[PDB]
Every structure is written in structure tokens, then in C-alpha cells.
Short mmCIF file of C-alpha atoms and ligand atoms in Angstrom, two decimals:
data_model
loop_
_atom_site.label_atom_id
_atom_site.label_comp_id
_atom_site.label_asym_id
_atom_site.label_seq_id
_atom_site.Cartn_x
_atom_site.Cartn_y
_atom_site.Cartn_z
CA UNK A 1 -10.31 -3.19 7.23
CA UNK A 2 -10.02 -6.86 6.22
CA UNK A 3 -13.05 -7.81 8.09
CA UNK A 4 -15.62 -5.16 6.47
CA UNK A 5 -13.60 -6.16 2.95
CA UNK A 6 -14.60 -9.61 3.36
CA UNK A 7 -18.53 -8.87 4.46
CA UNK A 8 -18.71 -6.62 1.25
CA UNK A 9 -16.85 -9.41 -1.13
CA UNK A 10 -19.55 -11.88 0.55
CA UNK A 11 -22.26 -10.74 -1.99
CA UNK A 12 -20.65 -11.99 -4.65
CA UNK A 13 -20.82 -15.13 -3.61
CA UNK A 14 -23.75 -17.71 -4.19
CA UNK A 15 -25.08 -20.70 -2.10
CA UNK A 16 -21.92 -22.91 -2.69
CA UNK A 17 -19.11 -20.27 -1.75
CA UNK A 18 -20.88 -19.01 0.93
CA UNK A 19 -20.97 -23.11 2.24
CA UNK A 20 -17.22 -22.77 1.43
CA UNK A 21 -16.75 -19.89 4.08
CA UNK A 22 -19.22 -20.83 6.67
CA UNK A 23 -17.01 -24.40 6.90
CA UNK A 24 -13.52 -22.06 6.87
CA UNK A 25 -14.24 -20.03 9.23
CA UNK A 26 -15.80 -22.69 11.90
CA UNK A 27 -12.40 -25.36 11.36
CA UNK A 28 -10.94 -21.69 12.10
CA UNK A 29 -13.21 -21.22 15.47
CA UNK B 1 -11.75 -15.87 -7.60
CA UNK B 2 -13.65 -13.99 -5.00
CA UNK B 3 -14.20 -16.48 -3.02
CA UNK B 4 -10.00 -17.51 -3.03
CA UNK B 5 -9.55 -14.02 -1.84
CA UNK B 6 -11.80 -13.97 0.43
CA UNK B 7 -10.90 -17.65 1.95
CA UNK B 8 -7.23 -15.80 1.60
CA UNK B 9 -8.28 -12.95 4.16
CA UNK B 10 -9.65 -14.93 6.38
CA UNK B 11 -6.35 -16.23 7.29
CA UNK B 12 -5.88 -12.14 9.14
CA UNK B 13 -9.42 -12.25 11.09
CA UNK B 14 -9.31 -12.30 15.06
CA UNK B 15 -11.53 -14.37 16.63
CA UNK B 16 -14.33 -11.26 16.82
CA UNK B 17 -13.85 -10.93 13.24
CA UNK B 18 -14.25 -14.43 12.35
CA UNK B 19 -17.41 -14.66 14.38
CA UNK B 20 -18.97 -11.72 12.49
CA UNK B 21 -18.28 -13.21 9.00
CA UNK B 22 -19.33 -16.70 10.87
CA UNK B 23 -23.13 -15.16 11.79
CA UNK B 24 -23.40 -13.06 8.57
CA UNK B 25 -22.97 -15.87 6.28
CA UNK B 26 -25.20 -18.22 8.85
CA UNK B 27 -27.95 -15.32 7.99
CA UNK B 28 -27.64 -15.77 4.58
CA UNK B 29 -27.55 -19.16 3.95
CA UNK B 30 -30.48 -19.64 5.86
CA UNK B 31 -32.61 -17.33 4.34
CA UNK C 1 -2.46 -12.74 2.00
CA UNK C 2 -3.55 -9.18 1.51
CA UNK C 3 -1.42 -8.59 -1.06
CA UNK C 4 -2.38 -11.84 -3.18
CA UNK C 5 -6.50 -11.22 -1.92
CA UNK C 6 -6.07 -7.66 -4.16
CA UNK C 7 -4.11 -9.02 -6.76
CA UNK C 8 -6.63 -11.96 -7.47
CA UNK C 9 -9.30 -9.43 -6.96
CA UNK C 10 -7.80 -7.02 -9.95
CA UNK C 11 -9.18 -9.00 -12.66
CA UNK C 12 -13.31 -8.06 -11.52
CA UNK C 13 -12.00 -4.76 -12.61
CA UNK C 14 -12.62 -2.76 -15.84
CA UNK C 15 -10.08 0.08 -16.83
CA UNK C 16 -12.28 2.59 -14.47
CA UNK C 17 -12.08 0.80 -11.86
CA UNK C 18 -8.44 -0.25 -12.26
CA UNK C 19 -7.73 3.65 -13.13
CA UNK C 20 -9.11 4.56 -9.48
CA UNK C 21 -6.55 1.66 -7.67
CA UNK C 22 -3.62 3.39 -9.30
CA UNK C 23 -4.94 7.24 -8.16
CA UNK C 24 -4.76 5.50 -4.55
CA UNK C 25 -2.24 3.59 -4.82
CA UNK C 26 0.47 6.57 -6.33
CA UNK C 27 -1.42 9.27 -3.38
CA UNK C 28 -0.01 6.16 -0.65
CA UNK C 29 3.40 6.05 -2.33
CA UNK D 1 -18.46 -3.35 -4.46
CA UNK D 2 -14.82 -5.39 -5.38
CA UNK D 3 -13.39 -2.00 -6.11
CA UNK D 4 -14.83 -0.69 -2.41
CA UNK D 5 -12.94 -3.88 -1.09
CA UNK D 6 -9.93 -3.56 -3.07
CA UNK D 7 -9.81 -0.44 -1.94
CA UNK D 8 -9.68 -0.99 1.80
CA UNK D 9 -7.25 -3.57 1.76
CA UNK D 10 -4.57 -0.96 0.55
CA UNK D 11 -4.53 0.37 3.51
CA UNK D 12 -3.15 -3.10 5.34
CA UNK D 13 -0.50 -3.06 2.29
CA UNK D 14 3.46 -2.13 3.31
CA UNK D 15 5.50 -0.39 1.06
CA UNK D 16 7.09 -3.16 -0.79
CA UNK D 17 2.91 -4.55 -1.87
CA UNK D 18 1.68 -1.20 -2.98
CA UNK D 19 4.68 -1.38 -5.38
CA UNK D 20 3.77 -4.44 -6.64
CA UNK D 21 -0.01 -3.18 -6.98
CA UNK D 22 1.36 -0.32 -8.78
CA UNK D 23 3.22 -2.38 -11.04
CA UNK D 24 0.21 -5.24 -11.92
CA UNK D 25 -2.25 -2.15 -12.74
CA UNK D 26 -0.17 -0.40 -14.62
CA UNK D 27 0.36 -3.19 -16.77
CA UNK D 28 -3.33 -4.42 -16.97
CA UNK D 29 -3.89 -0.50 -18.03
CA UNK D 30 -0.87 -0.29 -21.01
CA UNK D 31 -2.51 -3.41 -22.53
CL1 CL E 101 -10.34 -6.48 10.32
CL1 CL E 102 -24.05 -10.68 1.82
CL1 CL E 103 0.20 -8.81 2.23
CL1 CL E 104 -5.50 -8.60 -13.42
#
């Protein structure tokens, strides 16, 4: 459930938070 | 605020799930 | 982190929206 | 959208966080 929470909450987000994520997630990889 | 929840969650994503949110957000920063 | 993710996430919420969390949130208790 | 999320994450909550949900909603209603 977390997973398809997070892609919905992802719209939300513009240019600068979706940088924000995109660097999370690949320190997290 | 979104995006602290959602940096929050990620913290509970298996590696599947990380690469999902990892190739979604790839597709839309590039477009 | 769940728990704090929803909690942060409350406050995008107008009184409908917070009136349908409670309606779930009372059928789960 | 948020609410959809919001809404799927309480199903990963225990007892003791649904509570506490309860209890920050409720208040945000009264006031
Ligand atoms: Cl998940
Ligand atoms: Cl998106
Ligand atoms: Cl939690
Ligand atoms: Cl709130």
C-alpha cells in the first residue's frame, strides 16, 4: 500500500521535490 | 509537506518498490 | 513513519475530506 | 488524490496509530 501511496502523492510534487526523491531513493539503491 | 511524507515512506519500500518510484519519477523529470 | 506520513498529510485536507478519514478510521477500530 | 493516499496507508496502521489518527481528526474537526 505504501508504494502505490507514494506514486499517487508524486503528483503533487513539482520539478524540485521530484529531484528530492529521485536522489532519496538512489542513496537508498 | 508532501514531499516530507513521502521522503518519510520511503524509508518502508523494498528494493522492487524503490525501483518503481526510482523509474516513475526518472519519467517525469525527463519529460 | 506511516503514522507521521498521514499525520503530516492531514493538513491537505478540508473538513470533507477529514470527515471521510474518521468514517474509516472508527469502521477499523 | 492525498485523501486516496491517506487512505491506504491506514491500512499499514496498528491499533495504537489509528487511535492517534482518530484523536488528531477529531480535533482538527471540533475546531
Ligand atoms: Cl508497498
Ligand atoms: Cl506523477
Ligand atoms: Cl507507523
Ligand atoms: Cl492537521
Amino acid at each position: 500500500n505504501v508504494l502505490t501511496a507514494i506514486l499517487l502523492l508524486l503528483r503533487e510534487l513539482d520539478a524540485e521535490g521530484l529531484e528530492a526523491v529521485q536522489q532519496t531513493v538512489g542513496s537508498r539503491l
